[PDB]
Amino acid sequence: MGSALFLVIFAYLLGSITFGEVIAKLKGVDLRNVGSGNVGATNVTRALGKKYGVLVFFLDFLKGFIPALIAVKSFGIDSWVLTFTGLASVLGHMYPVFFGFKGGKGVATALGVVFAVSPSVALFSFLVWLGIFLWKRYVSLASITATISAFLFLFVAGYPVNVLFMAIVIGALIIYRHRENINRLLTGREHRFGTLEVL
Numbered sequence: 502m503g504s505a506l507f508l509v510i511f512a513y514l515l516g517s518i519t520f521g522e523v524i525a526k527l528k529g530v531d532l533r534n535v536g537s538g539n540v541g542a543t544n545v546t547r548a549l550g551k552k553y554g555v556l557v558f559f560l561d562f563l564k565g566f567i568p569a570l571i572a573v574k575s576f577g578i579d580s581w582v583l584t585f586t587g588l589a590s591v592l593g594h595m596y597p598v599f600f601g602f603k604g605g606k607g608v609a610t611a612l613g614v615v616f617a618v619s620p621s622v623a624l625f626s627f628l629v630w631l632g633i634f635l636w637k638r639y640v641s642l643a644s645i646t647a648t649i650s651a652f653l654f655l656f657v658a659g660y661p662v663n664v665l666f667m668a669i670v671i672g673a674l675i676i677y678r679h680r681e682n683i684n685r686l687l688t689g690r691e692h693r694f695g696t697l698e699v700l
């Protein structure tokens with residue numbers, strides 16, 4: 502259907518709005534040259550402050566939630582339209598047409614996709630993330646662990662193959678976007694998150 506193609510294209514274009522760069526540019530800051538140089542909510546928190554980072558997280562989450570919600574309600578949980586809508590949102594966040602195809606790691610937007618599929622699974626995956634983050638204070642370790650957990654939760658809950666395909670590809674892409682963090686974690690060179698007073 503034409504409406505299926507338009508929903509997927511809409512999801513990619515919406516995901517291509519790198520809200521970390523939007524907010525930082527509104528503030529005259531080049532997010533690629535402050536902090537870690539990454540463009541997600543974590544680096545916004547690191548460079549501009551937790552309140553700006555919460556805003557960016559919410560906006561990047563909504564990019565994934567809104568199109569996936571439309572897909573679920575219009576085409577059904579079993580539809581491969583949902584599969585490609587969720588993938589398009591995440592791929593837009595990672596490879597944004599509006600920001601030189603240099604985007605983020607995909608965690609916030611992927612959580613938004615999952616929330617449209619299953620708010621409970623999204624909550625459980627967030628709880629894993631927060632637990633792992635508070636355990637060791639590595640953002641990357643929390644995101645990798647929670648991404649794997651999210652797939653396992655959808656699998657054991659019995660979600661259909663279109664959803665599992667969407668989740669395994671999104672999850673693999675997220676882990677790939679963390680490949681440098683994994684290298685640092687394996688060699689003891691990953692930094693814990695926070696100011697010197699917090700740490």
Ligand SMILES: CCCCCCC/C=C/CCCCCC(=O)OC[C@@H](O)CO
Nearest residue numbers: 563566567568570571572573574575576
């Ligand atoms: C840009 C500033 C304004 C805020 C943006 C709007 C945020 C929320 C939008 C509502 C979500 C989209 C509607 C989803 C929905 O219920 O779709 C179900 C529909 O497909 C039933 O067939």
Ligand SMILES: CCCCCCC/C=C\CCCCCC(=O)OC[C@@H](O)CO
Nearest residue numbers: 502503504505506507509510511513514
């Ligand atoms: C790079 C993609 C974005 C720019 C181009 C967007 C539009 C491109 C091609 C038009 C495809 C229209 C397909 C409509 C279609 O098959 O509708 C049939 C359906 O509505 C009922 O069977």
Ligand SMILES: CCCCCCC/C=C\CCCCCC(=O)OC[C@@H](O)CO
Nearest residue numbers: 502503504505506507509510513589592
């Ligand atoms: C990077 C992603 C690119 C996506 C490109 C999507 C467009 C692909 C194929 C176009 C299909 C032709 C549809 C033309 C059309 O409106 O025909 C009407 C006809 O199908 C109804 O009888």
Ligand SMILES: CCCCCCC/C=C\CCCCCC(=O)OC[C@@H](O)CO
Nearest residue numbers: 515518519522523524525526527528529
């Ligand atoms: C169809 C719904 C779309 C919802 C999102 C709407 C788009 C919102 C933000 C993206 C563009 C923000 C650009 C703001 C702006 O002009 O900032 C200028 C300033 O950053 C200096 O370059």
Ligand SMILES: CCCCCCC/C=C\CCCCCC(=O)OC[C@@H](O)CO
Nearest residue numbers: 541542543608611612626630647652672
């Ligand atoms: C299997 C595919 C779906 C994966 C869903 C996403 C991973 C699940 C849970 C983590 C969500 C909480 C993220 C908390 C947070 O502050 O993230 C900041 C963000 O910038 C990290 O890159």
Ligand SMILES: CCCCCCC/C=C\CCCCCC(=O)OC[C@@H](O)CO
Nearest residue numbers: 555558559562566612616627631634635
């Ligand atoms: C449409 C419904 C929206 C539901 C909520 C969407 C936003 C989800 C999560 C935002 C929380 C991210 C921050 C997580 C967090 O507390 O990180 C740990 C750290 O802050 C502890 O110091």
Ligand SMILES: CCCCCCC/C=C\CCCCCC(=O)OC[C@@H](O)CO
Nearest residue numbers: 502504505507508509511571575576577
């Ligand atoms: C204008 C701003 C919001 C843009 C949202 C774009 C959403 C794209 C398409 C809307 C969904 C159309 C669904 C058509 C429909 O009834 O499909 C039913 C489907 O199950 C086939 O029988």
Ligand SMILES: CCCCCCC/C=C\CCCCCC(=O)OC[C@@H](O)CO
Nearest residue numbers: 514518522531532533534599600601603
């Ligand atoms: C619905 C349309 C939304 C459009 C949102 C605005 C996107 C367009 C222009 C904003 C600036 C894009 C370039 C940002 C960028 O990556 O700058 C280059 C970077 O290497 C700076 O270090």
Ligand SMILES: CCCCCCC/C=C\CCCCCC(=O)OC[C@@H](O)CO
Nearest residue numbers: 510511513514597598599600601602603
């Ligand atoms: C699949 C549908 C595609 C529809 C057309 C999308 C492309 C339209 C306009 C491009 C927006 C601004 C792109 C410029 C851009 O990303 O520049 C930033 C880059 O130089 C950062 O190094």
Ligand SMILES: CCCCCCC/C=C\CCCCCC(=O)OC[C@@H](O)CO
Nearest residue numbers: 509585588589592593596601602603604
């Ligand atoms: C539903 C699947 C749609 C596929 C869309 C894929 C995402 C959007 C554009 C593809 C870019 C492919 C090339 C990779 C790329 O962006 O290079 C990385 C960038 O950092 C260098 O400019």
Ligand SMILES: CCCCCCC/C=C\CCCCCC(=O)OC[C@@H](O)CO
Nearest residue numbers: 612616620622623624625627628631635
């Ligand atoms: C489906 C997504 C749901 C996520 C939205 C809810 C986020 C709300 C709260 C998370 C943060 C909890 C408080 C963390 C905190 O106070 O940590 C203190 C800790 O650093 C002490 O060592």
Ligand SMILES: CCCCCCC/C=C\CCCCCC(=O)OC[C@@H](O)CO
Nearest residue numbers: 628629630631632633634635636637650
């Ligand atoms: C397995 C999924 C659940 C999430 C991971 C569970 C790991 C267990 C506990 C995490 C709670 C946060 C505090 C852990 C801890 O020892 O923090 C030390 C810190 O508070 C003081 O240096």
Ligand SMILES: CCCCCCC/C=C\CCCCCC(=O)OC[C@@H](O)CO
Nearest residue numbers: 629632650653654655656657658659660
């Ligand atoms: C805090 C720790 C939480 C850990 C949750 C553990 C979930 C992981 C593995 C359990 C495997 C259960 C057996 C396989 C299973 O349910 O298959 C899924 C599917 O075939 C059911 O439709």
Ligand SMILES: CCCCCCC/C=C\CCCCCC(=O)OC[C@@H](O)CO
Nearest residue numbers: 595596602670673674675676677678680
């Ligand atoms: C069974 C299917 C397996 C599919 C292959 C796994 C894809 C995941 C990660 C890609 C790892 C290699 C990176 C590719 C690469 O150099 O891309 C860089 C840039 O030009 C485009 O992103």
Ligand SMILES: CCCCCCC/C=C\CCCCCC(=O)OC[C@@H](O)CO
Nearest residue numbers: 642645646649650685686687689690691
């Ligand atoms: C949900 C099932 C479990 C998934 C666990 C995924 C863990 C992924 C990558 C971790 C690789 C590094 C292992 C060592 C590590 O984290 O060390 C932390 C610190 O002590 C030194 O960097």
